[PDB]
Paper text:
In pacidamycin 3, biosynthesis the 3′‐deoxy moiety is mediated by [name], an enzyme found to catalyze the key dehydration of uridine‐5′‐aldehyde 1 to form 3′‐deoxy‐3′,4′‐didehydrouridine‐5′‐aldehyde 2. In stark contrast to most characterised dehydratases, [name] is small (121 aa), monomeric, co‐factor independent and utilises a non‐activated nucleoside, rather than a free monosaccharide, as a substrate. [name] is the only monomeric, metal‐free cupin dehydratase characterised to date. We demonstrate here that the reaction most likely proceeds via an E1Cb mechanism, with H42 acting as an active site base, however, unlike many other dehydratases, no metal or cofactor is required for activity.
Mutants E108Q, K16R, H42Q, Y55F and [name] were produced and purified, affording diffracting crystals of the same morphology and space group as wt [name], which raised our confidence that the mutants folded correctly and that the effects seen are specific to interactions with each mutated residue rather than global effects on protein folding and structure. [name] demonstrated a significant loss in activity compared to the wt. Finally, the significant loss of activity with mutants [name] and Y55F is consistent with their proposed involvement in stabilizing the oxyanion and underlines their important role for catalysis. Similarly, on examining the [name]–uridine complex and Y55F–uridine complex structures, we observed a high degree of similarity with the wt enzyme. Although there are subtle shifts in the position of both the ribose and uracil rings, of the substrate, and in the orientation of the 5′ functionality, these changes are small and consistent with our hypothesis that decreased catalytic efficiency of these mutants is largely due to inability of the phenyl mutants to stabilize the transient 5′ oxo‐anion that forms during catalysis, rather than having a major effect on binding competency.
Numbering used by the authors: 1 to 121
Write the structure that this text describes.
């Protein structure tokens, strides 16, 4: 009766600002968990007024820019970002992303686009 398991095969997969997102389709007000694959960067800076963003780095290496501060990231690191923090990042990484409470695009604000040449990856 209750669906507990979600697969990649049945997920929604799309590119957003240079990252490949896997959105599984589960609904839970307390948190959203998605996969993020990135080859060079997330070429847009945004913030979320409600939700914290927590990235677990499965593999690879990159750099987060959090309110313009560089934060290097590598495999097995956890990057925790409070609400109302400007975010972008560069890197070649596979990550698991938690947005808590649940992701709502109406909570997000566009700051600026980032030139693809700005990524050193
Ligand atoms: O469920 C989610 C979680 C994050 N993002 C997007 O992922 C990027 C940051 O990893 C941002 O563009 C953010 O809007 C989504 O589209 N959906």
């Amino acid at each position: 009766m209750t669906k507990y398991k979600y697969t990649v095969e049945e997920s929604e997969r799309f590119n957003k600002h240079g990252i490949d997102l896997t959105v599984y389709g589960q609904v839970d007000p307390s948190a959203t968990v998605v996969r993020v694959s990135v080859e060079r960067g997330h070429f847009q800076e945004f913030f979320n007024v409600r939700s914290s963003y927590t990235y677990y780095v499965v593999s690879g290496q990159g750099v987060f820019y959090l309110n313009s501060e560089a934060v290097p990231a590598g495999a097995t690191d956890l990057i925790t970002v409070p609400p109302n923090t400007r975010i972008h990042f560069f890197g070649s990484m596979e990550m698991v992303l938690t947005v808590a409470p649940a992701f709502n695009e109406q909570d997000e604000r566009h700051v600026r686009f980032i030139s693809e040449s700005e990524s050193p990856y």
